[PDB]
Design a protein around this ligand. Structure first.
Ligand SMILES: C[N+](C)(CCCS(=O)(=O)[O-])Cc1ccccc1
Length: 159
């Protein structure tokens, strides 16, 4: 079955710019700005739309070695990005896939809000733990903060 988790966070960066950097240039930025969270991102197949497979490797000493993520949808208008964890890490005989949905909304102050949905699909019913969910949210925040800091510091980047 499916376990559904939703979380929200804010950014000081406008939605369009953040979407261009944090979502659309993730393969490039994550290992550059957050090397202690993501060691590399390899494009396995595809040119960046639905079905594109990427292999995300974690640094030495992390709980997991790598995950394979697949792009599900990319909406450039409404800054929505759906992707699934499809192999590696938590995926195996207890968890088939994690489907994720990220939407970035502009706020009046010039910042943005990110709305994050994570659906865990389980082999029958292997209870997804609060600690797996925390770890996921934390890694996303670490990633978001490293990118945010790079965009604050490099005003020419992603205009
Ligand atoms: C995984 N991201 C979409 C970041 C998600 C963080 S969050 O859960 O705080 O929204 C980026 C990503 C990068 C490369 C490939 C596929 C996805």
């Amino acid at each position: 079955g499916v376990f559904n988790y939703e979380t929200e966070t804010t950014s000081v960066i406008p939605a369009a710019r953040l979407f261009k950097a944090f979502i659309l240039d993730g393969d490039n930025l994550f290992p550059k700005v957050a090397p202690q969270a993501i060691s590399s991102v390899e494009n396995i197949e595809g040119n960046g739309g639905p079905g594109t497979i990427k292999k995300i490797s974690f640094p030495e000493g992390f709980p997991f070695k790598y995950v394979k993520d697949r792009v599900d949808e990319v909406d450039h208008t409404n800054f929505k990005y759906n992707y699934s964890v499809i192999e590696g890490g938590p995926i195996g005989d207890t968890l088939e896939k994690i489907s994720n949905e990220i939407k970035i909304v502009a706020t009046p102050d010039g910042g943005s809000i990110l709305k994050i949905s994570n659906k865990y699909h389980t082999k029958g019913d292997h209870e997804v733990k609060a600690e797996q969910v925390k770890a996921s949210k934390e890694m996303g925040e670490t990633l978001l903060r490293a990118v945010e800091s790079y965009l604050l510091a490099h005003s020419d980047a992603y205009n």
